[PDB]
């Protein structure tokens, strides 16, 4: 019901009710009347450059039933600080990828191919290694790693699981290295063919006349439809796969039990926490009010293991609080 208009913006305002039939509307603007002609049922009022004049109380009365709607159009006098993780988009111009990271303040967008850093926001040398984009502002650094399937490389005996919220863009690069250029690559889903506007192929040469091929698959905006087991096969390589899980809300799965420990100031020890969580969580190790952040590193098994070592032989409660955009968590660690 609450509308936030950022500057002289050009957007459309539509509302639909599950009953399309011979029904009539009437728009009731800021202390003035307005005529309408909608679609079957969905009604709309679109605006190009919303002036401080074109804002406020906007109602819409309907009759089959005799309904009434009301909207409060406000303006962006407020610009709240944030750090939304990087997204990807293939430049329409050529065979290259672009990093779309949102944040308040605006961040440093750097592509890192592992290590080598190249702050460009537009990456063209997409071939191999560990490719990850990183956003860095006043808040901090949030990174989105490009999901890779190396058919040339050894298999990860875990069958990778890829999670993402409905509407987010799916990105899976399949890289294969072969001696001669004579080999192809193909994408497939469990009992469903891959869309023509969901695939792209790049190729270059390596060392002594070697050929590397990148056959990446992408989804503009994901849905329940797009969730499933994806597989990449090469005409000179073994078919390696990964399953795509669509999520409604963010989650943190960690064996929370609040564990108790005890050691003598002569022993070398580090507190641990294994967790499978999405999106990448913001973690904090707090003790007797003194809070220190964490090296939230990945165990690659199918979870990330966060560690803490600066115990300083100090006894007491070491609490680990970790949280993402749509989920929270806290684990109590007693020490003697």
């Amino acid at each position: 019901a609450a509308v936030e208009v950022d500057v002289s913006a050009s957007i459309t305002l539509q509302v639909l009710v599950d009953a399309p039939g011979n029904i009539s509307c009437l728009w009731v603007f800021k202390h003035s009347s307005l005529n309408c002609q909608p679609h079957f049922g969905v009604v709309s009022m679109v605006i190009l450059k919303m002036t401080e004049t074109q804002a406020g109380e906007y109602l819409l009365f309907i009759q089959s039933t005799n309904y009434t709607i009301l909207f409060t159009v406000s303006i962006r006098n407020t610009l709240l600080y944030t750090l939304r993780r990087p997204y990807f988009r293939k430049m329409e111009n050529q065979d290259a990828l672009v990093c779309i990271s949102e944040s308040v303040p605006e961040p440093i967008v750097e592509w890192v191919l592992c290590v080598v850093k190249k702050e460009e926001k537009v990456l063209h040398e997409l071939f191999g290694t560990d490719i990850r984009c990183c956003a860095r502002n006043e808040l901090g650094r949030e990174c989105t790693r490009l999901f890779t399937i190396d058919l040339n490389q050894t298999p990860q005996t875990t069958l990778p699981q890829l999670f993402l919220k409905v509407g987010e863009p799916l990105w899976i690069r399949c890289k294969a290295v072969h001696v001669n250029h004579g080999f192809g690559l193909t994408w497939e889903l469990e009992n469903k063919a891959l869309e023509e506007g969901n695939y792209f192929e790049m190729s270059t040469y390596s060392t002594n006349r070697t050929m590397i091929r990148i056959l990446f698959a992408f989804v503009s905006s994901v849905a329940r439809n797009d969730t499933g087991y994806y597989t990449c096969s090469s005409s000179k390589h073994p078919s390696q796969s990964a399953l795509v899980t669509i999520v409604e809300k963010g989650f943190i799965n960690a064996t929370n039990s609040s564990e108790d420990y005890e050691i003598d100031q002569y022993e070398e020890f580090c507190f641990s926490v294994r967790f499978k969580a999405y999106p990448q969580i913001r973690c904090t190790w707090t003790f007797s009010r003194k809070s220190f952040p964490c090296e939230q590193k990945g165990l690659d098994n199918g979870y990330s293991i966060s560690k803490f070592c600066n115990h300083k032989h100090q006894p007491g409660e070491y609490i680990f609080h970790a949280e993402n955009d749509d989920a929270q968590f806290t684990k109590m660690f007693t020490l003697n």
Binding site: E125, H181, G182, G184, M202, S203, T204, Y205, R209
Partner: protein, 134 residues
């Protein structure tokens, strides 16, 4: 037969234009090379004939190139070496060559790769094996 010429998978890389810009960055642009002056107009074999010739030049150049120039030549050579996968016949007596800048040869090679990229795997190039004069 072994008198055929076709490619199942694309022997033309996406980033070939990069390897040519990199070679050109260390080249003396007016180094004298040659190009065929009277190649028959054949929109199927045309670029392929010149790539074969350009390819023959990358080899000649490697022999008189410095240790590091050898790498840049060889790297451009790899981008167009696939033409030797086919039994191209030696140039006919009718074929006239004309002296041109290596910058001209490199530029044309790039152009030929671009034009050839969408068709290299769809066509049968068996009749390109004999270079023809217009």
């Amino acid at each position: 037969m072994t008198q055929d010429c076709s490619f199942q998978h694309s022997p033309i890389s996406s980033d070939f234009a990069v390897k040519i810009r990199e070679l050109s960055d260390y080249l003396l642009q007016d180094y004298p090379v040659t190009v065929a002056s009277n190649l028959q107009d054949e929109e199927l074999c045309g670029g392929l004939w010149r790539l074969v010739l350009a390819q023959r030049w990358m080899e000649r150049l490697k022999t008189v190139a410095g240790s590091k120039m050898q790498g840049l030549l060889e790297r451009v050579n790899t981008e167009i070496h696939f033409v030797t996968k086919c039994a191209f016949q030696p140039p006919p007596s009718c074929l006239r060559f004309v002296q041109t800048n290596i910058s001209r040869l490199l530029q044309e090679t790039s152009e030929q790769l671009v034009a050839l990229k969408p068709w290299i795997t769809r066509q049968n190039f068996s009749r390109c094996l004999e270079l023809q004069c217009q």
